[PDB]
Design a protein around this nucleic acid. Structure first.
Lengths: 204, 265, 216, 148, 89
RNA sequence: AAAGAAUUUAAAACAUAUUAGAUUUAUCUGAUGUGUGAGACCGGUGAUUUCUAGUUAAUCCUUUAAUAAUAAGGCUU
RNA sequence: UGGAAGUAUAAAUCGAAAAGGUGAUAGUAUUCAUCAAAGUCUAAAUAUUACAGGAAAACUGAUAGCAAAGAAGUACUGUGAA
RNA sequence: AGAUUUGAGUAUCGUAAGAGGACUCCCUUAACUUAAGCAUAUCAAUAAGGGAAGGAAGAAAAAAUAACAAUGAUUUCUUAAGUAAUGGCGAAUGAAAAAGAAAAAGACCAAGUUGAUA
């Protein structure tokens, strides 16, 4: 098959051939608008793996995000805090830049559903992704039993609640076991359950 | 006493009261009742294995598991696809633990299969399975004669000897009979070793009055009732030193370190 | 309400104003402004430690001690001195452990027949005392729906086979029925006074040895 | 029973049973176990002399199920079966049937030797044995059996 | 009568029963591995290894791999694959 | 040197030997035998533990599947 | 984070695989055990002091009980949030 | 001239927005308070600020436990348990396997194969 060589090839990102194509692609995206639509995915192997299907209702959107770390938004770097909270630099966002970029695409395209996103390239300033989006009101998506789960109401703004793979990884859902004791079924819900003080009806 | 109370956080919004407890009982019971009304053996709580518990603290107690392994279904001659539709839980994730686990859960399925009665997929009396079971009836009766007669010849010695020991214990409440049965049992086992059976048995499908039972795990008991065990005190047991055997076992394991160090020097 | 009386932005005016230091309502334009605040001594404030719905309503008692008291409550029902002292008219009853035939109970289907049985065994002296002395409650409890205050009469204890005669006895004023297995101090010693006048049926009486056993 | 409290017997007394000189104020020396080494040191010294410090080695993830080992002494063995069974086999010896007192089924893993045993043979089956437990069982004329 | 609870031969006497399946590649993965290698080449950090292995500084090559791969076992495998391709040319 | 039957019928891991279909590669993929891994002894064999006298080794406790050399943690001062 | 020579997330750099992860004391080695990440969906058992419709109460009884038992978030105050 | 790629305008048929947010999933480095002072810690996934949904939501079918006579998706309750551990080892913080129940259910993509290919 063709796609067993494209997948093997794409793992050699440090090669000269792939570094040249990434260099050209990042130049073009640095001048187009921040969020815009591309006709077909530039990485059709990785897009298909995450869920892209070349059918009606599947669209691909490229988002450019400014990577690195920003400062704590305090005016003139002045916070009235105890020395344990006085740091301005070196504070990292919990949500990965991929999940942050997915939300911007979702907010911009409010009538579609975010499926997943993958990595394209980066430079000294930017990092570029491509987001797979599905139109839930297309007749093709609705009438296909394997994909009409996206038409459920709870999928409205999937990435904002934290249901996409990029967003779910930031929630802690990367594995199972005793390493993920605090993220069993949701870190905040798990915390509330452990903190419940059960007062039985008949107690000593 | 140095007090340890974790009330310095907001416990008032952490309080959960059980005022809904008397009403949960009614709610769950009404759904259990409604489930049996809908399709009665759906609440039958599909049959489950008899697995041991974990750790040395619990390992001597049996408890219900989740689903029979695919090796236990083959041993009991059940199709794994048909098992889920006749109230049998299946767990392909479970790897077989022992031969004894395989045997014990093999009789659990066999005992369940004899009790089970499957109604025809179509109520009308002209259903195929009802028609086929009438068509091959003469072949089954011919086959039943061979099974009955050649069972009746293979167990002639074992059945007769088993009667003797049963009466031997009755009169005594013996050594000669026990030796005889033990020697026969070895030969029968050795005869079987010196061999192709049905892949799947038949599903028992018939028409019967609907006696509805709410589960099957309470019908097939996990373990037989326990009684006082008594043994013949012999000279061999009187001289067995359990303390010496435990310290030898403890010291042999602790001596595996010195063995490894000795070679490497 | 957890937010009752604490729904203000009140702060104290301090000293130097010839007024106490209790917090005061803020703003102007109404008579409410400058008044008292949350404090329990003030008007429209929160009370002393407000009552919380997670109190300890229901209590726990050991099961064996629960059964110890029921047997003592059953045993006290066979003492006419204690049964009468509780306020029961049992002068005309033949035997104080009054047991009726299970064949007679099986034919009872109407309240006219249930009354007939009570008259025959001379138990209507208690049933009529409750009827004749029914009165109304004395206090604020009438606003809450509790208006009529009645007295206690005979208790009818039946078995498993007397489940059709319950509907007859239930409408008779001051006659409470119970099942032999479901007995408790709330029936046998109402008001914490022992010696309820119990009317047994044949099946319930013959089951008492199985349920409780003996001293051996 | 709020009618039986002391507040109902102190209605009328100004200080409500807390003193006039030393009032009933908010704190009496801190909140909790404060001042464990400064002003409550004479308390911790008196009543918990080993409260502060460290001792022993840390077990990062202890397995408390591995230290589970219920134990029964020899004098309590025959109660596992009853005094009626004990009298039935009182006059047995080597050669004929003797009851087997298994302890794992009753939940005891180890047998220790304390007190005395009835002068009868017995077969005690358990996971672990003590050195003095096995002496007392063998001296009475019995046997020791291992399990698991 | 019922083994022993201590030592190497510890446990109730039973007949324990699982296949140690080997996750691996097929014979065609040799072709895909080689084809991709020609179409791509060697990374910057692999080439520096290939020079060190040419000079016979095998220990220094492993230390370089451990820096760029983060595992002693993964560094050994990379040092084996790099020197295997050295003998091919 | 002296005391010891040892519990009882439904089995997969594959170390291997032998063939079958393919591959040239750091080569594999099916199936048929065997042992492993097996356990039901006939007063006596004896698996097994103990005792003595040597000899080789290891020895303060822990890092919880087992060991090893570094490292770390214990206990006393 | 209870996770202690790093339990989880993220950022800078680096970056695998003829697979490999884990067995919570860092390290290398050989065994053993148990799984096979980096895509997706999934009823049932669970929560609820929005709001609506009901039923109950050892709850309050007009300075109480919601702030509000009457055209109550009304009269009135402030530029305004309130 | 023709075949494509990409990007637009217009027309048609639809989709998002706003209200509510008690319960649900997340972002953010508050402080009062406690430690009899206080600076790490505590208050504390707490307050406020911000986003997104449903009648429930979240999770869900082992790169999971365990070291056993072994288990077996997710969720919730009992217990483990104020325990192991964390901490100016101070004040304080603080789980999970086992075990007992409620309920129970498993399925698809990608990759691989079939190509007078659809």
């Amino acid at each position: 098959g063709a796609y067993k060589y494209i997948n093997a090839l794409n793992r050699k990102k440090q090669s000269d051939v792939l570094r040249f194509l990434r260099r050209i692609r990042c130049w073009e995206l640095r001048h187009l608008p921040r969020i815009h639509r591309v006709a077909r995915p530039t990485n059709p192997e990785r897009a298909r793996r995450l869920g892209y299907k070349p059918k009606s209702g599947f669209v691909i959107y490229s988002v450019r995000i400014h990577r690195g770390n920003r400062k704590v938004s305090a005016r003139k770097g002045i916070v009235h805090r105890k020395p344990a909270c006085q740091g301005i630099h070196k504070i990292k966002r919990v949500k990965s830049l991929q999940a942050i970029a997915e939300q911007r695409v979702g907010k911009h395209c409010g009538a579609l559903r975010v499926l997943n996103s993958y990595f394209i390239g980066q430079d000294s300033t930017y990092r570029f992704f491509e987001v797979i989006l599905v139109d839930p009101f297309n007749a093709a998506i609705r009438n296909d039993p394997k994909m009409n789960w996206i038409c459920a109401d709870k999928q409205k703004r999937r990435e904002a609640r934290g249901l996409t793979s990029a967003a779910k990884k930031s929630r802690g859902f990367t594995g199972k076991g005793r390493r993920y004791n605090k993220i069993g079924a949701g870190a905040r819900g798990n915390l509330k359950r452990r903190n419940l003080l059960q007062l039985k009806r008949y107690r000593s | 006493a140095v007090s340890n109370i974790h009330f310095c956080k907001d416990w008032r919004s952490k309080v959960h009261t059980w005022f809904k407890q008397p009403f949960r009982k009614i709610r769950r019971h009404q759904t259990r009742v409604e489930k049996a009304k809908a399709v009665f053996p759906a609440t039958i709580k599909s049959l489950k294995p008899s697995v041991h518990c974990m750790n040395q603290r619990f390992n001597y107690k049996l408890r219900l598991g989740r689903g029979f392994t695919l090796k236990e279904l083959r041993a009991a001659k059940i199709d794994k696809n048909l098992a889920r539709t006749i109230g049998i839980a299946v767990d392909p994730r479970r790897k077989e633990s022992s031969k004894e686990c395989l045997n014990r859960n093999a009789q659990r399925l066999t005992e369940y299969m004899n009790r089970l009665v499957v109604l025809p997929k179509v109520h009308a009396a002209t259903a195929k399975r009802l028609v086929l079971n009438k068509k091959n009836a003469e072949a089954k009766t011919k086959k039943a004669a061979e099974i009955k007669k050649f069972i009746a010849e293979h167990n002639k010695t074992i059945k007769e000897l088993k009667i003797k020991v049963a009466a031997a214990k009755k009169d005594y409440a013996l050594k000669a009979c026990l030796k005889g049965l033990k020697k026969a049992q070895v030969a029968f086992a050795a005869q079987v070793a010196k061999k192709k059976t049905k892949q799947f048995n038949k599903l028992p499908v018939q028409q019967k009055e609907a006696k509805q039972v709410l589960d099957a795990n309470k019908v097939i008991r996990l373990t037989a009732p326990c009684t006082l065990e008594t043994k013949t005190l012999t000279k061999g047991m009187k001289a067995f030193d359990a303390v010496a055997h435990l310290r030898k076992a403890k010291n042999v394991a602790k001596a595996v370190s010195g063995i490894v160090k000795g070679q490497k020097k | 309400s957890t937010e009752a009386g604490k729904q203000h932005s009140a702060i104290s005016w301090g000293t130097g104003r010839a007024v106490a230091r209790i917090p005061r309502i803020s703003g102007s334009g109404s008579g409410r402004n400058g008044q008292g605040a949350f404090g329990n001594m003030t008007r429209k404030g929160h009370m002393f430690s407000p009552l919380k719905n997670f109190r300890k309503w229901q209590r726990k008692t050991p099961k064996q001690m629960r059964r110890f008291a029921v047997a003592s409550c059953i045993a006290a029902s066979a003492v006419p001195a204690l049964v009468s002292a509780r306020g029961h008219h049992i002068a005309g009853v033949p035997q104080i452990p009054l047991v009726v035939n299970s064949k007679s109970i099986s034919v009872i289907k109407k309240t006219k027949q249930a009354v007939y049985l009570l008259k025959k065994i001379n138990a209507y002296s208690d049933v009529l005392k409750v009827i004749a002395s029914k009165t109304v409650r004395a206090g604020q409890g009438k606003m809450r729906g509790r208006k009529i205050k009645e007295r206690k009469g005979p208790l009818v204890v039946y078995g498993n086979d007397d489940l059709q005669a319950v509907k007859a006895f239930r409408n008779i004023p001051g006659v409470d029925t119970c099942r032999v297995e479901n007995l408790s101090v709330l029936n046998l010693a109402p008001g914490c006074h022992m010696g309820r006048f119990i009317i047994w049926t044949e099946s319930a009486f013959k089951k008492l040895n199985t349920i409780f056993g003996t001293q051996k | 029973a709020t009618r039986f409290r002391q507040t109902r017997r102190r209605r009328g007394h100004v200080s409500m049973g807390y003193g006039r000189i030393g009032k009933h104020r908010k704190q009496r020396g801190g909140r909790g176990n404060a001042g464990g080494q400064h002003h409550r040191k004479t308390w911790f010294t008196t009543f918990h002399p080993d409260y502060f410090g460290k001792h022993g080695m840390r077990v990062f993830h202890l397995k408390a199920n591995k230290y589970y080992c219920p134990s029964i002494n020899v004098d309590s063995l025959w109660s596992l079966v009853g005094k009626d069974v004990q009298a039935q086999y009182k006059n047995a010896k080597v050669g004929e049937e003797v009851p087997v007192i298994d302890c794992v089924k009753h939940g005891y893993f180890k047998v220790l030797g304390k007190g005395f045993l009835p002068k009868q043979p017995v077969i005690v089956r358990a996971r672990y044995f003590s050195e003095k437990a096995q002496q007392k069982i063998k001296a009475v004329g019995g046997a020791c059996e291992l399990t698991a | 009568m019922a083994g022993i609870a201590v030592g190497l031969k510890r446990g109730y006497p039973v007949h324990t029963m699982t296949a140690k399946r080997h996750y691996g590649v097929t014979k065609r993965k040799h072709v895909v591995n080689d084809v991709i290698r020609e179409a791509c080449g060697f990374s910057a950090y692999e080439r520096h290894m290939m020079d060190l292995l040419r000079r016979g500084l095998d220990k220094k090559a492993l230390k370089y791999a451990k820096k760029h791969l983060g595992t002693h076992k993964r560094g050994l495998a990379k040092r084996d694959e790099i020197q295997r391709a050295l003998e091919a040319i």
